C-alpha cells in the first residue's frame, strides 16, 4: 500500500509524510461553508490485491492547520459527514486493486460569524490529515500524514453571508465630486442583516474619516460616505432588511467633506472597513 498526489509527491511502503498543494475555491452554503475538496488530489493503491485487502480510515487527530487551527466543521468520508476535528476513527475504505484510486475527502466549516473571513496566504498550511492503513494479513498499522497547503491567495468565509469583493478600490474625481462604490452582499438564506463602519473619524460629529495620504497630503478635507444621499455616522448601525440569495447593493457613495479651516491642494486617501452584523 502506497499513495501519491496529483503533482507526483509520493509516500512509499510503510508510511511517511507529504505535501499537497491545492487551489482553493471556497463557497458559502446554508449550513456550513466549503473549504476544499480533496478528490482526485490523492491516489492510493494496493500492491498484492490477490491475497491482501487494505483498510483505510481517517485516524483521530486530524484537524485544521495554519491560521484555521481554531475552527471546527464536518468531513465527507465514504458516505457520511462526521465532526471535524476527528475525535474518533472513521469507518473503513477498502482498497482492492493495483490501479490507483482516489482518497475522496472534503472539509467543511461551521459558520461562527455574520460575514467574517480569514485571509489565506499562498503556500500556507490549512489542514493535516492522518491516513491509517491496516490489512488482513499481519500486524501492519501505518500512518500517512498529509499536509494540505493553499496554492493561491483566497479568503475563506467564516459566516453565513458573503461579499462581492473583500478589497474594493474606487477613485474620486477632483474636488468637489463623488462616485458610487460597487459593493454588494448576499446570504445563503433570508437573514435580517445590517452593517456599520469602523475607522479613524476626524470630526466631533463622527462623520468624516481622517485623510491619511502618504505623500503630499492636502489639509482640511477628509472622506465622508452617503447612503441614498444621507450621511452615515461611523458606528451607527445601518439596516438592510431581509437579504437572500439575490445580491443586494449597499448603495454606498464617497464624497468630499471639509474638516474645518482652509483647504489646500494635495492627495486624499482614507481607509474604511465595513462590518456586518445580524439583526
Amino acid at each position, epitope marked *: 500500500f502506497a499513495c501519491k498526489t496529483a503533482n507526483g509527491t509520493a509516500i512509499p511502503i510503510g508510511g511517511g509524510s507529504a505535501n499537497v498543494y491545492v487551489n482553493l475555491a471556497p463557497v458559502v452554503n446554508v449550513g456550513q461553508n466549503l473549504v476544499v475538496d480533496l478528490s482526485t488530489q490523492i491516489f492510493c493503491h494496493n500492491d498484492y490485491p490477490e491475497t491482501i485487502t487494505d483498510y483505510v480510515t481517517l485516524q483521530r487527530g486530524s484537524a485544521y492547520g495554519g491560521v484555521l487551527s481554531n475552527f471546527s466543521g464536518t468531513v465527507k468520508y465514504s458516505g457520511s459527514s462526521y465532526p471535524f476535528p476527528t475525535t474518533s476513527e472513521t469507518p473503513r475504505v477498502v482498497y482492492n486493486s493495483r490501479t490507483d484510486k482516489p482518497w475522496p475527502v472534503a472539509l467543511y466549516l461551521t459558520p461562527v460569524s455574520s460575514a467574517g473571513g480569514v485571509a489565506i496566504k499562498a503556500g500556507s498550511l490549512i489542514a493535516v490529515l492522518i491516513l491509517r492503513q491496516t490489512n*488482513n*494479513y*499481519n*500486524s501492519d498499522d501505518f500512518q500517512f500524514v498529509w499536509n494540505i497547503y493553499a496554492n493561491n491567495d483566497v479568503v475563506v468565509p467564516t459566516g453565513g453571508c458573503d461579499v462581492s469583493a473583500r478589497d474594493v478600490t474606487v477613485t474620486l474625481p477632483d474636488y468637489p465630486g463623488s462616485v458610487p462604490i460597487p459593493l454588494t452582499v448576499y446570504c445563503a438564506k433570508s437573514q435580517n442583516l445590517g452593517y456599520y463602519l469602523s475607522g479613524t473619524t476626524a470630526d466631533a460629529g463622527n462623520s468624516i474619516f481622517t485623510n491619511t495620504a502618504s505623500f503630499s497630503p492636502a489639509q482640511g478635507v477628509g472622506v465622508q460616505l452617503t447612503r441614498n444621499g444621507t450621511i452615515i455616522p461611523a458606528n451607527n448601525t445601518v439596516s438592510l432588511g431581509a437579504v437572500g440569495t439575490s445580491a443586494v447593493s449597499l448603495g454606498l457613495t464617497a464624497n468630499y467633506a471639509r474638516t474645518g479651516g482652509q483647504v489646500t491642494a494635495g492627495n486624499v486617501q482614507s481607509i474604511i472597513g465595513v462590518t456586518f452584523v445580524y439583526q
Partner: antibody
Amino acid sequence: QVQLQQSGAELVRPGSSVKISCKASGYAFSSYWMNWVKQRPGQGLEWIGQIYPRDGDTNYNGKFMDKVTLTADKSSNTAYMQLSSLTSEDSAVYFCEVGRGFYGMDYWGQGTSVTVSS
Amino acid sequence: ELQMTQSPKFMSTSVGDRVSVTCKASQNVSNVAWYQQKPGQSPKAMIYSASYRYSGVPGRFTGSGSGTDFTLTINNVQSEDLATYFCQQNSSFPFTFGGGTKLEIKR
C-alpha cells in the same frame, strides 16, 4: 518464543459436540491467520479451515464447512474449534498452525487426540 | 481442487547418499512447501516457495521446480532425516497436502 498450547485429549460418544481449544502466546494473537489441520491415524494431512481473530473472518474447506465452526476469543488468546454430529470418521489428531505473516518461521501445536466411540 | 500427487509412497536410502522426493500437481502453482513429520510428533516446515529453507534447517535440504513437477532433495543423510515428507500448495483455496513419502534405511 512463540508457542501454541492445545487442550487435552477428548473421548466422546457419537452424536455429541466437542469444543477443543488452542491457546497461543508469544505474538500478537489477533493479527495473524490460524490454520487447523486434521490427520487421521495412519493417513495424510488435511486442511480444515482458518480464522483471522481480529475481524472474525473465516475460510472453510468445502468438505468441512457444515460440520466445523471456527471462533476466537481475543480476551484470553484462545482459538476455538467445534465439531458437531460426530461420526466414526471424526477420530483424528487436530493441529493449529501459525506462520503466514512471519518471515521464515513456522509453528504448530502438539495436537489434540479425539476418539469417538460408543 | 488442486490434487497434489506424490509417488512412490516409500523411498529407500542408505546413510550419506542423496535422495530425491518428487511432487507433481494437477494445476500450475506458485508456492510449494515441504513438511517433515516424525512418529508421534507434529509436522515441521522445511522449505517454502520451493527453494528457500526455514530457520534452523540444515543445508542438506534443497528444493527445485516451478509451475509443476517440484522436487525436494537431500544430499547427505544423517540418520535424523528418516521421516515422512509432504508437499503443500497454498496458492488456491482449499489448501491441499500431498500423500507423503516415508524415507527409510536399506540393509
